[model samples]
Target: ADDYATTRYPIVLVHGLTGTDKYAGVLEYWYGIQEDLQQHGATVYVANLSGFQSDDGPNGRGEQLLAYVKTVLAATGATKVNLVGHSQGGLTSRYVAAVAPDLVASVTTIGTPHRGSEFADFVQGVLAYDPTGLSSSVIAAFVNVFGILTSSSHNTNQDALASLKTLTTAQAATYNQNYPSAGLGAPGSCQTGAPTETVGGNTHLLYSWAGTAIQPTLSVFGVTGATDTSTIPLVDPANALDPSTLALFGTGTVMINRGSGQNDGLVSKCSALYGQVLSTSYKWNHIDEINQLLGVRGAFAEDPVAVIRTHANRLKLAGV
Candidate 1:
């Protein structure tokens, strides 16, 4: 038995916007990354928060997270926790660290929008201009149905538009001022901000990583070449998130067209940085960062399972 990944504090996984701990009791938001960590001598917990909701207000997502963190702490009897947050989860993780520094040991973000996302701008545009409020209604309806199907907590008083507004560039700028992270207010275009953040003299360690490309699913019906396998934007039985990977690629294109650099189907390399960035060169998408859709990241990309375990080991060595 090796203690390579054993950490002093329990490791908690925080999911992003439009995410949950489990999906219909069959799919996990983090896919196999949780098991990988658990097997390597780490105590881990997956957090469940509203899939769509702002982090402001009294009953916002942050409050939900704060309450959940307390529950995890009580359940595990651990004083501090290491937070591994993905996408919007990273933001809330930082929120906890800022407001309740004593509760967090470290914060590692995967594909989080530290500066904000360009995709939100596009959606905001569509929602803002629709004359009959058709776009907003359609989105809210779709999210509600999907939340029910996935058993996610969208909550009764959820405002989908308000949720979307928080991810916009303008909103992120204001938030950074209020929350204040070490890597957030750095002076550069894409350099990783600071390595650690001192909130209330606690000094939380922060880390980040992202991917730029998605694995292409093989074409089922368009294999015309003897050696070439035709691929199209469609569902992949091998990996459930393959279609979503393609979908994010569409938004990635939009980011590039909008003058944002290469994105991992949703977040750009620059926007994903907060603290010491691990790397943005991985061949994974936003979903792949969590190793979702049955753990099929890509044929050539490094295993996300290993990445999590290694980070756990890093935490182990760092005494966190």
Candidate 2:
């Protein structure tokens, strides 16, 4: 175990929308990645931030994350922590890094929508046009109640509507202005490379990656799933087989809504681009990036745990 995965700082795993640190007694939101990282000689912690039901938005969650990081540092006697976030969690980690760079060693996002998502815009439009005036509130109520029912009391204070709004392009514009990235890639394209920058007088690094496949067979329903119609037609069956394919349909949906491009179901590869473009395209979709779907990935899908471990090692080598 000591032969690999050792880093100067602890590693923290952050979850995305409707994500939980642990579900029921037998399931975990990040699956078994936590234990795997530990076995490889890495100290790991999973931050159970507010789920999608929370109206706090990324800024609020980032604040909570700051507190959690403090606790982790104090407990482990480490100087800082490495952050690895998925989807919305990726943006949330950015907020924390921007506000408190001294606490973060490095930030890596998996299939995160740095520029916002078209799916969010579509959902907002759908909710707004509904004849029912209480559409937003109604959905919020449902999420709150469902969280409680599932024993995830942390979601009791969440506002699903607000979360969606925060992930919109309009709101993302404001976010970029407030927390600008150093040497960030051009919009609507993947980053040419990674750059190390100084923030809050501390050296900070950023990295990101996403997939662009739409495997309907791996989705909730084979090809007949409702997401197939709502998102777009599946084009890459070999790479798109993931639960998120049922909802996002990866770059295929991005092409339909934006233009010809790659995506990871809910987030386009273009939107997933951030500090550095690890890969504009991967074989896995959104959920596959986190190694979900009962641990059954597509034949061509990259191993999520292996990817995470490799990133952790990357940080270790960089002395983060």
Candidate 3:
């Protein structure tokens, strides 16, 4: 490893909900990508934004992410960095970049629900809350439980089902209507952010990657004989996919963006397309696009790490 000495910008990887810096599995998600980028003469950093590790808050996520940016600057003496966020972590980075474009040179998102996930609605419904109208305790409960590793509380009560349920067509249209300031395109444009590009000052180039799988299918180690998605309550064999009995903390028209089977389960192609649509077909489910392992439940992509590493190389070549 040449220690990324000659790289133009450092690369920062951010994980999604229920994730952390110390979660070995979470880190494993980036292991291949980190090593690959380093081999290619690129400096890499992982942002433990939410879930268990970076539980401070959105502002805290911003602070810590920018802090890492500062650390990279001090270490490599670089001017800016290329940000890659997976899922909610990507959303958090969007806020960070929006607040301080000076620190980011480019951005790429994997399985990010730019608009929002119906799953959040589901979470809010069960817990009976909404981001637009979240109480301190409800929000606190979300942070406290989600911050830890896949706790039963996290999985059973208000995590998977609520979060994944948000990506609906109506939700996409409404999100576009509400956040007019967002530069992303229409729900079906298959692009990034609001109808237009929303990066300020910094030479930010944004890209997105999405996948589709309702259940786990990556039978690597722990994931063997995976016959059903029952492991996931959202897709649990028992629920019978009932929307009313299900969490609808929000609404449907608010999430399902667009494109056929093109979503991270939560975000459709239209929603995931916001910011910038890099590729329309990844077949990897929402969490799979990032570093989340399927355990004995699913198989790790041979190129799982390549997804992000190549994301950086693509931008580098494009000179974004």
- Best prediction by lDDT: 1
The clash numbers for all candidates, in the given order, read 2, 11, 47
Positional deviation of residue 228's Cα in model 2 after best superposition, in angstroms: 10
lDDT of each: 0.77, 0.71, 0.53
* TM-score to true structure, per model: 0.88, 0.85, 0.65
Q: On residues 103-201, what C-alpha lDDT tens digit does candidate 1 reach at each position?
A: 998999999987788888888887889789887899887875676566444345455676788888778767778888776746336777778877776
Residue 25 deviation, candidate 3, in Å?
8.9
lDDT of 2: 0.71
* Model 3 misplacement above 4 A: 1-7, 24-31, 52-60, 129-183, 186-200, 215-262, 294-302
Model 1, 104: alpha-carbon shift in Å? 0.7
Candidate 2, 141-195: lDDT as tens digits: 8875655444344446566777788787677656767777773565545553356
Error of 1 at 190 (Å): 2.6
- The positional error of residue 240 in candidate 1, measured at the CA in angstroms, is 8.9
